[PDB]
Design a protein around this ligand. Structure first.
Ligand SMILES: Cc1ncc(C[n+]2csc(CCOP(=O)(O)OP(=O)(O)O)c2C)c(N)n1
Ligand SMILES: Cc1ncc(C[n+]2csc(CCOP(=O)(O)OP(=O)(O)O)c2C)c(N)n1
Ligand SMILES: Cc1ncc(C[n+]2csc(CCOP(=O)(O)OP(=O)(O)O)c2C)c(N)n1
Ligand SMILES: [Ca+2]
Ligand SMILES: [Ca+2]
Ligand SMILES: [Ca+2]
Ligand SMILES: [Ca+2]
Ligand SMILES: [Ca+2]
Ligand SMILES: [Ca+2]
Ligand SMILES: [Cl-]
Ligand SMILES: [Cl-]
Ligand SMILES: [Cl-]
Ligand SMILES: [Mg+2]
Ligand SMILES: [Mg+2]
Lengths: 525, 525, 525
């Protein structure tokens, strides 16, 4: 067998059937004779390729396979990899290298010092020392991406390797099964359970790895048993809990002092599937107030090591959430009372308040909608105004890197064909990966894109206020016609200048058979 | 509090009380006002410092703390770090950096691009961005070294940081407890147990992480229950099983074909705490023969990813060995029969056969002796001839890097003051870290060093035979007087030119109150 | 032709005829059939191998070729590479890698992520992607080490590559000639010359790259023409000027304030072949005083970029020194007056003052002696007391990394068989690379080693005073018998407890036919 044949067999035997890519010369010998049971999803720039693959992996809860062109293609994707690292996305990033005989001279298309290029944003990065090693190296890539803590990996392959003879012993790779589905030993788990049972006022904080693990329902059971309020850890990349459940308390402010104040009076704070903590603004103070102790369950040693406070347990989130939910006592305390509905913001017949947009989405969208957020100044109101009952209902660029939501929404929609995806994206953010729209059109992936157009980088105006910064250039983005951009890439386009038009546009978008972009005129901050 | 005071408090609160070091200017502000509850162990070169710390960590089963001088000191230790990486040794390597104000100009003693220096031989490598961050960075170093899979880490600290004010919020670091003591979830563990119970001819292969976990006794119980032969995985850095137990089958040959042949007819091979596999010689063939399947339990994702065959489970070795030993059925198969005693090699009144040396050590040493091996051509015979009943009884440079055993034997002896340490070291290997002898003398650490003097790099002569290599230079090391070297560093020295003298020298060494070096004249290969 | 044959032909055609090494399994296929026109110089540990090669390269003013064993051997040499980086030593460091078929599994002896291991201490680091690329990669290594600014490079080669067929087109590599012998363009050189001619009180500062370029005599002519005082830049790795020439003003103090004070009143300061500046102690103040401007000529862009003051010209030191010496006007100012002889320090009949040792060396050594310095507390007095008339007469560890002088003195002596090498090494420093002594004995390289034995790390005691550091551990090194260590490695040993014995020992050492170690009892600091 050839390295080509053996590698595709390994991929299919490990559950991979889709290649997200933008092709190039070094990759042609990999992509030729493309297997009929695989699909290839083309995107027009590599940030888009990786964003789409990332949304697909996160929603599908399995690895996604990517093929990029050498150094330039890999480089175009590195902002996307920054998000993927923070979301623990299992991405297998492959890139083609020059033919081995031309690497030394650094011919055009040579990826120099290739394994170092995507560092430090990958778990593992490698170029094999021979063609026959390629299937083994691919096996390593698959498992490194897939083992807890999941994350992106990188494999560079010289283009002449694919036609070479494979090692017959590579067949042992095909059906390898690697598990990291582990939980704390019985003795120490009993100690933890006792501590939870004995807490007088426990609180629970959940991060993105809960949703990645589909541990949401177990966390609901855990919170109900403990009669404990539940927050989402700050800078949330996913939604780990039903947002109208009586225990839900919303998104934590991303500040040191704000969080310790919030947790004051809680004797035991159990954090599951989150870093401790992904702060954002500089809000100095106490990490925790006296009387509060913290226990973190995380899938990631790097998270456990860097937490500035608390104990930690490094284990699988799914396994730990299930064990805890089933072992803790039913507390006789009263179940927390549900948060009140948010207020309706006054809205005239002109430009839309973001609050109005979210209220209307919540009114009109199906109960199993999936939202993405890259509308950076409106995140708090989005979290308060969307009822998200189900797992996998929310995605936000995990490293804050813009250019995620537009392509990721296409990948999520591909992963979840029966759940309507609605990406709410600011006018500034929409540009970073604008060309991703084309992929939705070409493959008829019916994502809805809601562009919040206020003409400015609103979040930067806000932070400029906080940091007390005057005379900052480059904050405004006037003169972009998003309907024309959508037309450019073949996506149906609508425009909503007021509430009447917003409702009409959403009605038409929800009924449409393909992707739709709605440009919404929102109020200037 | 100062960064100095806070950092030493963090260290003591995390169980660290010993600094292995070779000092320099950048480190003086760290070492000044050295706490009276700490000890400092000086060695004369950094390979020695790290080797001693490594032996101490491996034997004590806890992290060891190291302080080296900038880039040059760190660099002198990098061969030692290669071994530490392969043995999963929890080493906290700190090095001093120039004062922050002189880093930019690259004053003498500036460690340039410091975090990159020890890569790729460390789990984590870092230089903090401010003085107040130092205690937090130290906390990260402690936990990164200590979490499974354990390994060396590196922290560089500008010398002016120590006197600066610490963050009062650093107190939250002091008592953090981080656990990776995890095992496979119940459902999947039950599946594994069933597979073991159902095997018709199981075999067990154990690696160094079994001994690191003190999982030895549980593995004995597991092997007895399953009535299974037990091998030690190739290139063994530690001994994970009693070598005269009836199930014991010895050290596996470090070859692909040799191992698959050995395992032929075994339907399920359970590997615990080893890479799959640390082959050495190139011995191409089948990874496994038809009819054999392999299941690996490893603490290290990198091991699970790169195994060319078998299933894998990434979990704590102690927790997994205990669970398996206690859950499996008692097989009604007959317990394996003990291996026969090795033959006595004919020995005249002249130079010693290595076999004679090992037989005599086995005859005379206490039953709780601890051996180290850096006699590279005699490893197979050492493994056959020493009865090692207890855990922690054997160490061999895990990456094959010479210069380990001499200093490590001093660290092991420091860790285990009641167990006589006997390091068996070739004349070639003895030189790499010869200056370590001084530390044994100065602190009166009563390690016994047995130098196997055959005048040559014997293992290289052997491999030259295998690789069919003629006219190779640099294979002979004549003209070294090891008694004089020992005298040079203050260690009592004896010489054994024949068996009578070997017995006499061992009797005197075993009775001595300090370290002793015995130069043994061994037969040329 | 084989890769082996082609690579050795490339080496000999590029002037390389000596391999400094410590062998291992991965290197056997390189070292087999070792060519009869090459020599192999064995050392017992890799810091020693590289130190010897480094001294040889620096003294010979040509590249030296090194062969080390995989990661562990490379790692043992990394402290040595820290010095080599700072001295711009042209070192070609090769290391053997596992056979390509066993790299993926990480068999014992695999150098993982090999090219990253010696970073950041090398100019170029590489592992070829195929056997046929090896000669080209070696060509790159040769030229990268040899081009200005010279420095160490690293090449890792899988052991199975050597027997493979070479590319016939590799013959084009054999006679390539690469020049960096460049100087500033005529127009701008005329401007510089004018500025020098017009200076009212110029000063000259010279660094190690002057001696590396053998630009010493041209700098003498330049200083005489300009009637300018000449200093050696701080932390000096080499001696660039005759130390009794009337213009010579000695070694600059390694402090910011000290240097600006020294240069006060000098209107133009011309620095040649030095970083600006290799400060050591933290001595904050003005980089230059008002009225002083600085012009640096350096072979190294990294030096030009990081200088905190002055203009810079990046060019070949030999070419620039020659051009300047021949173009500047003869100033009518009076030639500077020679520094007075240093005072004789009172000396009783007991332990030796370092000053006495240097005065006696100066009295007795040949006028073409070559000195090395690793006696860290006595550097200032050494510089004042040794008349060094000739180029290539002084070496000091360029990064301050101890373990340089002992092996480097052997390499220097090998390079300069007619010039008596005398290495003055502290008792502390002597241990780092003590095993290097064996190489001097084996090859009968008649280096003289003068061990300054004061029982302590004296320089650290001094800096502890400056940094105001009390209760520092690990500063004393009692109980080392250097005569026994020398005997251990086959080197004739003498001991000097007083001046009478020092003179007698030096007389015997200077007359000896082999290497000699003299242990000198020096006064405690
Ligand atoms: C790739 C990238 N570039 C720049 C930024 C910085 N950034 C953060 S928020 C923001 C503004 C985004 O504006 P928009 O999408 O219109 O949303 P708004 O803030 O107006 O709600 C920018 C530019 C970033 N996070 N990522
Ligand atoms: C730091 C380092 N340098 C070189 C080697 C290569 N090497 C492997 S075995 C060996 C010979 C050791 O000789 P000795 O200790 O006398 O034992 P013998 O082989 O004679 O039994 C050498 C040099 C190595 N493994 N590590
Ligand atoms: C590899 C390395 N380790 C540690 C140091 C720090 N250091 C600088 S000077 C010094 C003392 C050397 O003592 P010795 O050679 O006896 O000379 P003395 O200072 O007594 O004159 C030390 C340990 C260093 N520069 N390099
Ligand atoms: Ca509503
Ligand atoms: Ca906006
Ligand atoms: Ca016996
Ligand atoms: Ca030997
Ligand atoms: Ca004199
Ligand atoms: Ca000294
Ligand atoms: Cl358990
Ligand atoms: Cl479970
Ligand atoms: Cl010109
Ligand atoms: Mg990079
Ligand atoms: Mg490195």
């Amino acid at each position: 067998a050839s390295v080509h044949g053996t590698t595709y067999e390994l991929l299919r035997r490990q559950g991979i059937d889709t290649v997200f890519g933008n092709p190039g010369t070094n990759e042609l010998p990999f992509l030729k004779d493309f297997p009929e049971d695989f699909r290839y999803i083309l995107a027009l720039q590599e940030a888009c390729v990786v964003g789409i693959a990332d949304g697909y992996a996160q929603a599908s809860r399995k690895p996604a396979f990517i093929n990029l062109h050498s150094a330039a293609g890999t480089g175009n994707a590195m902002g996307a990899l920054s998000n993927a690292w923070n979301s623990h996305s299992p991405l297998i990033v492959t890139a083609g290298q020059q033919t081995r005989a031309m690497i030394g001279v650094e011919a055009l298309l040579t990826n120099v010092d290739a394994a170092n290029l995507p560092r430090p944003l990958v778990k593992w990065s490698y170029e094999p020392a021979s063609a026959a090693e390629v299937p083994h190296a691919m096996s390593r890539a698959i498992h490194m991406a897939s083992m807890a803590p999941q994350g992106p990996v990188y494999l560079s392959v010289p283009y002449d390797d694919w036609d070479k003879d494979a090692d017959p012993q590579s067949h042992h790779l095909f059906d390898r099964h690697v598990s990291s589905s582990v939980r704390l030993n019985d003795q120490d788990l009993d100690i933890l359970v006792k501590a939870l049972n004995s807490a007088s006022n426990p609180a629970i904080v959940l991060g993105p790895d809960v949703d990645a693990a589909n541990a949401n329902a177990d966390c609901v059971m855990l919170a109900e048993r403990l009669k404990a309020p539940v927050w989402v850890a700050p800078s949330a990349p996913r939604c780990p809990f039903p947002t109208r459940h009586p225990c839900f308390r919303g998104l934590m402010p991303a500040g040191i002092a704000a969080i310790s104040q919030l947790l004051e009076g809680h004797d035991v704070v159990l954090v599951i599937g989150a870093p401790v903590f992904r702060y954002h603004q500089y809000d100095p103070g106490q990490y925790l107030k006296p009387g509060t102790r913290l226990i973190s369950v995380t899938c990631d040693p790097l998270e456990a090591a860097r937490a500035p406070m608390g104990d930690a347990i490094v284990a699988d989130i799914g396994a730990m959430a299930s064990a805890l939910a089933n072992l803790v006592e039913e507390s006789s305390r009263q179940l927390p009372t549900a948060a009140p509905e948010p207020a309706k913001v006054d809205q005239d017949a002109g430009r839309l308040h973001p609050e109005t947009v979210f209220d209307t989405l919540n009114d009109m969208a199906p109960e199993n909608a999936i939202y993405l957020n890259e509308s950076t100044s409106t995140t708090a109101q989005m979290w308060q105004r969307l009822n998200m009952r189900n797992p996998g209902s929310y995605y936000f660029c995990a490293a804050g890197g813009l250019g995620f939501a537009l392509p990721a929404a296409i990948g999520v929609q591909l992963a979840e064909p029966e759940r309507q995806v609605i990406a709410v994206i600011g006018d500034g953010s929409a540009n970073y990966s604008i060309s991703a729209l084309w992929t939705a059109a070409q493959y008829n992936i019916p994502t809805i894109f809601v562009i919040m157009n206020n003409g400015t980088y609103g979040a930067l105006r806000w932070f400029a206020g906080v940091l007390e910064a005057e005379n900052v250039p480059g904050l405004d983005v006037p003169g972009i016609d998003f309907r024309a951009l959508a037309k450019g890439y073949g996506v149906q386009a609508l425009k909503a200048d007021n509430l009447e038009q917003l409702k009409g546009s959403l009605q038409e978008a929800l009924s449409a058979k393909g992707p739709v972009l709605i440009e919404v005129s929102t109020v200037s901050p």
